[PDB]
Amino acid sequence: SDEEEKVRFYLEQAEIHYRLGDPEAAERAIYLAKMIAAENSDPELFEEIEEFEKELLE
């Protein structure tokens, strides 16, 4: 799925941005990932992105 591929890309960006001390850049990527999941009517993926984001912040 193109949606899943684009979300994976943005989550990868979020992980390494957060690892390197740039949480705002990480949250810019998470925003785009959530928007793709929301646009595609994918609540499960949207929820997975939130759990991903929560694991990063904690």
Side-chain angles (χ1 to χ4, degrees):
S1 169
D2 302 357
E3 168 213 33
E4 302 165 21
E5 184 274 325
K6 293 177 180 55
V7 170
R8 190 108 92 184
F9 172 86
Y10 283 132
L11 294 188
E12 179 280 318
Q13 296 237 259
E15 181 201 28
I16 194 139
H17 276 152
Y18 205 95
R19 170 62 180 85
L20 297 174
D22 201 341
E24 179 49 43
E27 288 293 341
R28 288 173 178 152
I30 290 169
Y31 177 84
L32 297 178
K34 291 185 177 182
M35 280 237 311
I36 297 166
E39 286 164 357
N40 281 264
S41 298
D42 199 333
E44 185 174 4
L45 188 51
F46 195 95
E47 184 269 348
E48 290 180 8
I49 297 169
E50 286 181 339
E51 300 298 317
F52 193 90
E53 181 187 40
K54 184 178 178 70
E55 289 172 355
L56 255 49
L57 304 172
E58 295 178 341

